Amino acid sequence: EIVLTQSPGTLSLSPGERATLSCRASQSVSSSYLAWYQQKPGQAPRLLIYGASSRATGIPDRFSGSGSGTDFTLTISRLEPEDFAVYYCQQYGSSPSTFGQGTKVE
Amino acid sequence: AMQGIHFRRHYVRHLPKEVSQNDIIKALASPLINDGMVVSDFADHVITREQNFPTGLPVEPVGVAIPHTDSKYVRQNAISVGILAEPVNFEDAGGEPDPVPVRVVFMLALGNWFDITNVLWWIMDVIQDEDFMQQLLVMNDDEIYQSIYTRISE
Amino acid sequence: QVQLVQSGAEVKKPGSSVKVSCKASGGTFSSYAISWVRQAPGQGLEWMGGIIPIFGTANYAQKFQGRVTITADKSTSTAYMELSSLRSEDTAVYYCAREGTTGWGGKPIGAFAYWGQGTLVTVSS
């Protein structure tokens, strides 16, 4: 039921620059049920952020999640060539869990 | 931290020796229906789930049960505690053919499926405490509420 | 660490069913939620369903409600997913996933910290 619409669809930045990815929800999702994933080509999605702001183990400080209610944001501050991948946002506050369409960072 | 879960004063209760498994589920679910946390026929679906998927946990010293049903029948998140004078036999959740003599029941009503394991983790932490579970057998309804409410708010 | 070794790729005809397994190891099996996520070629992720093995509480999305069956064998620490009535749309990479835990080695978080290698199911005839 809850649709996640991410933006931008595609992005192309230089290394060192900041990248602001957005994830808007159709309904008010509780902050504690929002997560961000990183998926490189040929690999499974790697968990970056969970519970809106909390950062998973092994993920560096440059990744930082923020938001509440409808608007949610993933901020990649200092881009590295390894960060070139597709980024999805997920809601798991109710069944069924739904993902966004994805944002390709180049 | 099992957050976003309700717990009122009327959610704690003691049951007499004459009560069975289905009587305990009906008794522990009665306050949840009145407050509008679950559906009207919540107790019925909890009984049917218990028959097919047991929730009895043979933890020493005091045996524990975690009766529940699908998130479909839960409107708002809540928990109700039930204490027994004499031990009532629940089936083993692990699938073992031995019975679990339960004295403390933790009826869980959770609307979000993804929050279930947070509650279970919180229950598993509480039941491992030997000193706390022994207190629940002696404490009254007012004393149990204050003990659980403090533990829940963390 | 937690490892999720899925079964190999399969090539089924339209109409038939398929059953993919997900062998879990490294951490506790029963006390945590195992989910199944699907991804068609260049399409993105969709949550099919999941299961918490301890009480067999399986949950399904409305779209796959009926034609999808998720189970978990506690005696072998393996989760399964059987999709029936297969069509061309079902051609996708099927992932099994497990929720992570707070801190090192912890309370469950909900978000999928661990993922399997994936099982490529192809539907054609």
Numbering used by the authors:
A (entry chain B): 1 to 27, 27A, 28 to 105
B (entry chain S): 8 to 161
C (entry chain A): 1 to 52, 52A, 53 to 82, 82A, 82B, 82C, 83 to 100, 100A, ...
What is written in the article reporting this PDB entry?
An effective HIV vaccine will likely need to elicit broadly-neutralizing antibodies (bnAbs) that target the viral envelope protein (Env) as part of a protective immune response. GEPs showed detectable, but extremely weak, binding to soluble Env gp140s and extremely limited neutralization potency, though some reverse engineered epitope-scaffolds (ESs) showed robust GEP affinities, well above the B cell activation threshold. Reverse engineered ESs are ideal reagents for studying the binding properties of GEPs. Multi-log improvements in affinity for ESs were the result of improved off-rates or combined improvements in on- and off-rates, with a small number of enhanced contacts to antigen observed in the crystal structures.
Five GEPs (1, 2, 3, 7 and 8) bind T117 with nearly identical behavior, including GEP 1 and GEP 7, which differ only by alternate J segment utilization, showing that the two incorporated mutations did not affect binding, so no further IGHJ1*01 GEPs were produced for study. Only six of the 35 predicted somatic mutations affect sequence positions making direct contacts to the core epitope: Y/K32L, S/Q93L, T/S31H, I/V51H, F/L54H and T/I56H. However, residues at two of these positions (93L, 51H) contacted the epitope solely through main-chain interactions, which were not affected by the mutated side-chains. Only two somatic mutations were predicted to contribute to a stronger binding interaction. The Y/K32L mutation replaces a hydrogen bond involving the tyrosine hydroxyl with a salt bridge. However, minimal mutations of GEP sequences to include these enhanced direct contacts only marginally increases affinity.
